[PDB]
């Protein structure tokens, strides 16, 4: 029977400094006991000073990131190039995820 999900490994870490933030991730992407790649970046600069990682099933991760980057693009067009503040990003992402509440993106996501 076809399983639409898989697990690509990876661990990610986000820390909020007082006037900086870091978001870190390993670059290993795995499938069971095989290494698919030793360097596959997983943390992305999304524009407007926001970094994002969506970890777990990479195919879902990439879809999500891509969709969020695209949402930043549209935010610019519709709101006269306004900056997408981090809190506004977070709410947006909740709607992206919840939109697939009954077929979830299988990722833990950190911005």
């Amino acid at each position: 029977q076809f399983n639409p999900y898989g697990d690509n490994g990876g661990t990610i870490l986000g820390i909020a400094g007082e006037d900086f933030a870091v978001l870190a991730g390993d670059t290993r992407n795995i499938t069971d006991y095989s290494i698919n790649s030793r360097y596959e970046p997983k943390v992305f600069d999304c524009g407007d000073n926001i970094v994002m990682s969506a970890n777990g099933f990479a195919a879902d991760g990439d879809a999500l990131v891509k969709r969020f980057k695209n949402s930043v693009k549209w935010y610019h067009f519709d709101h006269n190039d306004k900056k997408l503040s981090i809190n506004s990003a977070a709410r947006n992402i909740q709607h992206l995820l919840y939109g697939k509440r009954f077929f979830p993106y299988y990722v833990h996501t950190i911005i």
Binding site: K66, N70, K73, F77
Partner: protein
């Protein structure tokens, strides 16, 4: 003639004309002038913006479509909002699906075919806006002219809107010179502001009145207005 045949886009006149299309064409001619031109390294749009009062803002004529493409309008502004929005999506699709910047030429074909569908069917109306599209793609710099008849033409330079003929002659004369302004964004823009001046019987181009956009080799599509166009008057 005219009388009986201009009632909808589904009717030819007895000489084979499409009157609703010509009437839409007519809304362009009464828009505020705008000029496009390009060299091998950049493409430039300049538009004259109309206000309504001295109490009103000046209505925007330049719309950005992607990082490498954008346009100007003369005619019905909401029609431009529709068509540029479609162009935004076409660009976006190309990147999302093919990881590929949409060629300025494909953009023209897509606009032509969208316009066309509104000139052959019942209950539609043509678009009543004209469009100048600049872009910098894998084959360099490009300017396109779109007419709501669906005719899309690739050119070195052009103008559309009221009294556009001035600019169009000026550019037709300047051709060999402005085509060569390679790697000098400011010169080409100055060449465009000269072109646009050939179309003011009007009055005088000012700082809340002039709009300029530019795209080229290492330059994302970008728009200047206000204090940002001061250095060109």
């Amino acid at each position: 003639f005219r009388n009986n045949y201009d009632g909808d886009t589904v009717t030819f006149s007895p000489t084979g004309r499409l009157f609703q299309v010509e009437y839409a064409l007519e809304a362009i001619k009464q828009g505020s002038v705008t000029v496009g031109l390009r060299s091998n390294t950049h493409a430039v749009l300049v538009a004259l913006k109309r206000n309504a009062d001295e109490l009103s803002s000046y209505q925007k004529k330049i719309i950005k479509c992607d990082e490498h493409m954008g346009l100007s309008l003369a005619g019905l502004a909401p029609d431009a909002r529709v068509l540029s929005n479609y162009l935004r999506q076409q660009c976006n699709y190309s990147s999302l699906v093919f990881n590929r910047k949409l060629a300025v030429e494909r953009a023209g074909h897509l606009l032509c075919d969208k316009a066309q569908k509104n000139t052959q069917s019942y209950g539609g109306r043509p678009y009543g806006v004209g469009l100048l599209i600049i872009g910098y793609d894998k084959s360099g710099a490009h300017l396109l002219e779109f007419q709501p008849s669906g005719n899309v033409t690739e050119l070195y330079g052009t103008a559309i809107g009221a009294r556009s003929q001035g600019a169009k002659t000026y550019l037709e004369r300047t051709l060999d010179t402005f085509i060569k302004i390679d790697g000098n964004p400011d010169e080409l823009i100055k060449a465009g502001v000269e072109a646009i001046s050939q179309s003011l019987r009007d009055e005088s181009l000012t700082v809340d009145n002039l709009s300029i956009a530019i795209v080229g080799k290492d330059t994302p599509f970008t728009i200047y207005d206000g204090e940002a166009v001061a250095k060109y008057i």
